[PDB]
Design a protein around this nucleic acid. Structure first.
Lengths: 85, 80, 205, 80
RNA sequence: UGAAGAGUUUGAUCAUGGCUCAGAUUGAACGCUGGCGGCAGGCCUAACACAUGCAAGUCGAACGGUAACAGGAAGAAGCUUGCUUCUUUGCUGACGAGUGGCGGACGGGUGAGUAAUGUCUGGGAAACUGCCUGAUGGAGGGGGAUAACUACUGGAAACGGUAGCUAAUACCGCAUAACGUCGCAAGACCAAAGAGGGGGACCUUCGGGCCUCUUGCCAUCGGAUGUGCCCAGAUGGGAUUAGCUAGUAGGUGGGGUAACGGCUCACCUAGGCGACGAUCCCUAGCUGGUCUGAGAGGAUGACCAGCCACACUGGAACUGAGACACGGUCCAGACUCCUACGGGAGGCAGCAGUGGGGAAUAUUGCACAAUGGGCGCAAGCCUGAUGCAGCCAUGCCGCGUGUAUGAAGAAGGCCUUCGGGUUGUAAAGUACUUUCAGCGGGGAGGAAGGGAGUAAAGUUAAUACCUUUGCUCAUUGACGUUACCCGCAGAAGAAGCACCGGCUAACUCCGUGCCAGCAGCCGCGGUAAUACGGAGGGUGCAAGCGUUAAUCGGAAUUACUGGGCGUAAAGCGCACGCAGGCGGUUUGUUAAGUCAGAUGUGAAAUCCCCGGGCUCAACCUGGGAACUGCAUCUGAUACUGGC
């Protein structure tokens, strides 16, 4: 009949067209930092790092990745730019 | 510390671990005679200097690997 | 259950008058009482001790009218707090409401008293009680209700009791048909100080 | 979710009604944290009605538990 | 601290030895019989499938709309012609669905799977919390669809596909950035909504503004129960079951979560488990407890309290504080009902009913009145939960089936020192009295909040609205022939079943003649059979009696307590070596064994022991014991262990 499954069958796709859209968007802004370590310059990579944090903060301040995953992604990429010459 | 024991090494085939044998020291619950009863622990050791047949001192901790909830403290006696 | 049928057979097996059909038919017997239970006993006598132990098991409970399950249930309260079971059991059987109403004189037998207790006529501590499985408290009141005081059977029960001796462990005012139960009796004051070696081993195994 | 409540005890014909501090998880009268007294509907020869421990209820009300209305006025008439 | 022993090999007699029994426990079973009140118990089998009906709904004090009732308005002026009808309209109290929200993960059912890193006890470190109930702040304004409804296209229809309308405390941005987070840093990031009532001064389409009471939104830190994760120590049986393990055991680089971890991907190693029993098979859910017995040690984990796992079967996903999700989704399998031929939809190991599988296991019960839980600011709604009746000897408990009168024994029978005896005072007929049931008249308590009043400097703007603990009044009941009280009739509605040579209480007449039969054991049965048949009499339990089974006992018959091996089972032909078991005579050290004293934990229930109430006990319970332990300190130091 109805219960909660009938609503969840349409509203979970409306969520997959908003929340999972931003999951994939954030993962693309992360992938674009692993290109900027091939620009021959440390300041061009630091430019692309502060181009990636503003979407990681949007998922951290909203409370989806705030327990460790935001601090893990920020630290992991901070090490890749502190590794450059 | 919560638990701290001494025992004897039986396997040294590991680069961050050893296997240690310890005694129960127990009265048999119906036949009344005392028994040694040997039980095994897989123990954390990142120095890799203690070896087989040596006597070691070990302490209980939070899990470090599967079946690995103890870590090395001292080498008590050297068996050569 | 309880026993039903011919009554003289009961007084014949108990070797004693039971107040059953015991008017002018009791005078100088001629009724097989103290003589002939059954018809045999003198020609092939077995004299078995299991048979006397079985006879004691009937004898000790039929006087109080209580059945086997009831008797072993009182024995359960006599066998706790060490032995001496015959004296500790006596205090329980003598504390029954059918036994106390019989000792107050309102019945010619414990069964006649038990049948007056069932007929809603008896009250204890100021309220009506219709069970004989009750136990009377010391210095508590037992009384008969007004609509039973003039009954010809009860009149004849108090008329029998006033021709006999008094039990000292209770008192009743015949001008009110009311009074108090003082204490549970003692086996050496109710009869005599003697040992009965069967009753201290009775029931179980 | 902890509350102070008058619990169903002894059910049929002659109930006793104990008063308890308990968590709202699962069952109506399952697990409890502290049992603090009894309402007891029987006054027959006894002064053992409406009893409550005034140290234990004060250790929960407004400091970890809520109070049920069927106890919220009982606390002012304890064995009165 | 509690205390069952006996029978049978033989000419036997003492030993030894198999077999068998009296008892207690049970949700038990067959059969005969079965009266009245109470407490408990009533598919441990196929984890087999289910007709009919019902089980988790709720909110108009967010609101697009209007199923319903009575009103307000507007029409037809109705026939149903003297009433207040018919038809519309959300105006209003309201509310059949729709949007939206809270909760659906609990309350019930069950033992198939599982010898388990499952579960219990006792600890531990890396881990959770929507709601409930506090605490500090915010409390501005927009943008974008759609169900209901109306049509198009197919169907008889549940309902698929497709165009159109439209509301929000729903949905998503911007500003703000808190009691949140980050970089040396300009900074970079996450919100939100009102709503119902009332009123002083003034304005007013006197609804609106403004103020204020009640109650909502958003963020962050608490309060406190409980959930995840891991480690000792234990769990049914087994070795004429010996091997089993490539994510198994270990390393080295990268990832995932609220956290642990071979949780997970890759590159390398040969480890790990196993005789203190791995592999594998049958059996079995775990604990509190229950419970046999002298006790040990097992057995047993239906009921009540707490865990595990299952939801016809397998495997996933969506959502949330919480799900490998009873009665949800979704795919596939096995089985079934409906068809107008489009195909569609299911699963009672819930509550009541029904068929299989069996030795064998409730009504197709009354109501939501109260109480719990869900929703509701609240009156209320929901409930096979729960109250509260029935059916069934299955156990236990209270209580029955009445009294008087009646013969040197009527009539019959049974046995005849043939004299008498005896069933039996029993019967006939004659008179008395009723517990329990049947049937009447009276009749509680579970009832309070709620409706009205009164009061409270109630929160305010003190006694408007509203609202609350008491008080004054009218009231709310399924059960019900109830609890309890008094009567109306009549012995009326009521007694079985083995047992009687000996163990084992009851006696020994005739018939049969090793047959017919009996039987637990010993043994009985060929011309008086104390044992069969047939008897009359006699004993014992009793709404039970006989006949069995499960699990124990007797059983020391697996031996700790507590054995057997010269010859009554078995000393292995002898010496060598050996994991394990035992170890001189002393001092010093340690406190693992042991022992002492503290702090905890062994939930509630329960045996035992002491008090109280139900008419007694059971039951409902106030208290003390106990769960001999397992942890965290402190302490003795004799002896075993260790140094």
């Amino acid at each position: 009949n109805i219960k909660s499954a009938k609503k969840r069958a349409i509203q979970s796709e409306k969520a997959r067209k908003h929340n999972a859209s931003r999951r994939s968007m954030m993962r693309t802004f992360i992938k674009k930092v692993y290109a900027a370590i091939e620009a021959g310059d440390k300041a061009a990579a630091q430019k692309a790092f502060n181009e990636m944090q503003p979407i990681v903060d949007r998922q951290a301040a909203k409370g989806l990745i705030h327990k460790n995953k935001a601090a893990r992604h920020k630290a992991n990429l901070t090490a890749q730019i502190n590794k450059l010459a | 510390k919560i638990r701290t024991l001494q025992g004897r090494v039986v396997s040294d085939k590991m680069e961050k671990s050893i296997v240690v044998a310890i005694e129960r020291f127990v009265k048999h619950p119906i036949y009344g005679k005392f028994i040694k009863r040997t039980t095994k622990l897989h123990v954390h050791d990142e120095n890799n200097e203690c070896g087989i047949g040596d006597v070691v001192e070990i302490r209980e901790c939070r899990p470090l690997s599967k079946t690995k909830s103890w870590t090395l403290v001292r080498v008590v006696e050297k068996a050569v | 259950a309880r026993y039903l049928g011919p009554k003289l057979k009961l007084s014949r097996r108990e070797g004693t008058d039971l107040f059953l059909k015991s008017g002018v038919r009791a005078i100088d017997t001629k009724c097989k009482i103290e003589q002939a239970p059954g018809q045999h006993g003198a020609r092939k006598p077995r004299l078995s001790d299991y048979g006397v132990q079985l006879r004691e098991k009937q004898k000790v409970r039929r006087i109080y009218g209580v059945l086997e399950r009831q008797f072993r249930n009182y024995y359960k309260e006599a066998a706790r707090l060490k032995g001496n079971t015959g004296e500790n059991l006596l205090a329980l059987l003598e504390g029954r409401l059918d036994n106390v109403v019989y000792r107050m004189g309102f019945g010619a037998t414990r069964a006649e008293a038990r049948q007056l207790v069932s007929h809603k006529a008896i009250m204890v501590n100021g309220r009506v009680v219709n069970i004989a499985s009750y136990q009377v408290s010391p210095n508590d009141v037992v009384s008969i209700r007004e609509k039973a005081k003039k009954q010809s059977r009860v009149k004849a029960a108090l008329e029998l009791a006033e021709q006999r001796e008094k039990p000292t462990w209770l008192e009743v005012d015949a001008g009110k048909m009311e009074g108090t139960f003082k204490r549970k009796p003692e086996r050496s004051d109710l009869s005599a100080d003697i040992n009965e070696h069967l009753i201290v081993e009775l029931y179980s195994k | 979710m902890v509350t102070i409540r008058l619990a169903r005890h002894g059910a049929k014909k002659r109930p006793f009604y104990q008063v308890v501090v308990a968590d709202s998880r699962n069952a109506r009268n399952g697990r409890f944290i502290e049992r603090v007294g009894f309402f007891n509907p029987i006054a027959s020869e006894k002064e053992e009605g409406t009893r409550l421990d005034l140290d234990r209820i004060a250790h929960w009300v407004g400091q970890g538990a809520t109070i049920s209305d069927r106890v919220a006025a009982l606390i002012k008439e304890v064995n009165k």
